[PDB]
């Protein structure tokens, strides 16, 4: 406890005083220089002294737990307002949370931290705050390294046939939040393999939407994202009226494993589970066996129908009400997208056949039916087309 | 592919072939100095070539494939443990689950690969197949840092920890020396240990375990048997004959994450009608859920109330949940699971940043009695684990 006991009263003020105060802000800077410039276990012991700080008052039980809300959002507040070597106190912020992210299980304590600023961190950097800009191949190298992170591929990914943009806080240039990556086609997309590989294309198709920051992951930018993006793809083309993705459906197989044979024979119908022995003959016992069994054969109709519609029912009616269980279903779903159509042997990638038997899924935005689509999603009905109603 | 399809072949025979194969394991051998000598994206994009080839099969009913696909990705351990860069294919079967281990959620498709080796493991290096040798300041220095990775950074720490009134020993599998599978601390004192900040031989008449690690990353999650501390615990008898009285001065890592996610209802049937009153009569208001009572439980380490409902809160946490059998505590379910009995729950026993993060400073001791733990294991496995009078009372 030698200086570790100046850093606490720094935290204190910190935590403690009004956001105007001078000295409190003044305090602020100081511990913030203190970290940025600290070895690695520097930093996660003065996080020690963080949630040792964020956990107690310097007087009912609702009245503390509020005080100690209060307080952590307070800490927070006062940092994203000083306008160092990062970006701003908003920026420091962002790596502050890196850190908190990777050492939660080093440095136990930082949950209540963690989520108050995860949420802060939704209302700051909600898209409608954020600015978006084109990525192309004569972007500064130094913004493009950050991409990479999160170079030929990039160039085919940047070209004439290719759209990429990002957004940036106002306050914070050079750092992209967020990655989009889309492709001009003729067609809307059914395999991955052939975008990552202008006269006549009528298809915009996201290919690829990625965090750039740590300290960000978890936090939720808002439903407009891809509304906005499209603003500008019919700004720039008012010829553009067909938008679609090409998404992985990541979370289908670990999901698929840990179901029952009763579940799966719910989920199929007896007329699938009859066309499923009268060509394959056993029914898997289990989720783990019809992994096995939907990945023995990328050829067999009867698979891939099962498959299919096993997947459907994954992204469509598996999710605590209004919240897709699938991660990916859960952001496109949220921005108003409708779940298009499901793609057997869209990803034959190694990690493609691992995550979902190399099945991909086509979320389609129309740009007059977002809120529509974003009001049902709340009430438990994910739009659908003709053909994934079909499947179910 | 230019090569990817050598390593495919390889796998097909290491999965495939026979034990006896002499072809298959020299594909194998072939495998490992591949596998050993490559860069860390290199050996990730070899990963994805077995999990490509553990996921199908060459050139059957459904319930057979599941079989074929269990028994070749076992049969391809059990060529690799069979061999004699590492100390042997036991060896590099071991750093070749720590890296399958960090990187499950970058390479996908080993979880099956994973499940089946730590179940190999725990047979492997069951505790009856490890020896236990002694550790000392006279040790060698490469091996003494093989337990500070796994305890400040200065080699001081480790000197009084490996000190006269100390006794530190561990698990070593005998074709493998010189790498530590499991680190045991022992400390000898008058009384059993209530605050571990204190023992971090004339009249000592207690032997203390306060700390067991596993220093194998990818060994994590490997059960290594029930008689683990018994053994320790025979070492420690024949060593010194008059030492009877054995406990552990153990931690409680996920109370608070436990707690937290308790609504107020569970904890009101937890604490009782006389213990909500008399908190009432002490504290006024009840908190209104776990989270909240983390945070009350936080607030004064002194107040008598709040000592005793977190030590109720703690002995029903580490006894009574969990999926029968197996309580909800890893550390419960290890010291449990070797025949000990929950002896007596510690305030202010861990006072420092993480002990009050962990378990508002909390601590338990576990107390093994020679000729018992049979007795208590069984009694585990009804769902009924082993009380003292003590932690009875809190319940
Ligand atoms: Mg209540």
């Known amino acids: 406890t030698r200086a570790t006991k100046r850093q606490r009263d720094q ?18 800077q100081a511990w913030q220089d203190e970290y940025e410039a600290a070895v690695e276990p520097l930093r996660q012991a003065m996080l020690g002294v963080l949630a040792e700080v964020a956990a107690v008052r310097d007087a009912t039980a609702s009245g503390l737990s509020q005080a100690l809300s209060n307080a952590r959002i307070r800490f927070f507040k ?64 130094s913004l493009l390294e950050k991409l990479i992170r999160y170079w030929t591929d990039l160039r085919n990914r940047l070209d004439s046939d290719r759209r990429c943009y990002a957004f940036f806080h106002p306050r914070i240039p050079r750092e992209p939040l967020i990655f989009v990556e889309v492709a001009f086609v003729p067609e809307m997309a059914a395999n991955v393999q052939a975008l990552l590989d202008l ?12 965090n750039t920051q740590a300290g960000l992951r978890g936090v939720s930018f808002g439903n407009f994202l891809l509304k906005r993006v499209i603003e500008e793809l019919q700004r720039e083309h008012p010829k553009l009226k067909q938008f679609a993705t090409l998404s992985p459906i990541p979370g289908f197989a670990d999901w698929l494993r840990k179901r029952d044979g009763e579940s799966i024979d719910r989920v199929l119908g007896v007329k699938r589970l009859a066309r499923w022995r009268e060509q394959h003959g056993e029914v898997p016992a289990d989720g783990a066996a019809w992994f096995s069994a939907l990945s023995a054969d990328t050829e067999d109709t009867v698979i891939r129908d099962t498959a ?23 952001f496109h779903l949220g921005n108003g997208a409708c779940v298009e159509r499901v793609n057997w042997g869209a990803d034959m990638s190694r990690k493609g056949r691992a995550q979902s038997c190399g099945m ?17 999603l709340g009430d438990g009905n994910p739009r659908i087309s003709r053909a994934v109603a079909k499947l179910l």
């Open 360 to 376: 991909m899924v086509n979320y389609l935005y129309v740009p007059d039916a977002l809120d529509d689509n974003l009001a049902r």
């Open 199 to 210: 006269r006549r294309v009528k298809w915009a198709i996201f290919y690829s939407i990625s």
């Open 11 to 28: 935290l204190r003020q910190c935590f403690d005083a009004r956001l105007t105060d001078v000295a409190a802000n003044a305090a602020a």
């Open 78 to 141: 006062r940092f994203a307002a000083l306008h160092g070597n990062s970006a701003c106190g908003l920026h420091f912020l962002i790596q502050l949370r890196a850190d908190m992210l990777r050492w939660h299980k080093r440095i136990p304590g930082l949950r209540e931290l963690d989520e108050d600023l995860e949420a802060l961190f939704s209302n700051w950097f909600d898209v409608g705050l954020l600015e978006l800009q084109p990525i192309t191949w004569d972007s500064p190298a």
């Open 308 to 330: 299919m519609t096993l997947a459907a029912h994954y992204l469509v009616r598996e999710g605590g009400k209004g919240v897709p269980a699938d991660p990916v279903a859960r």
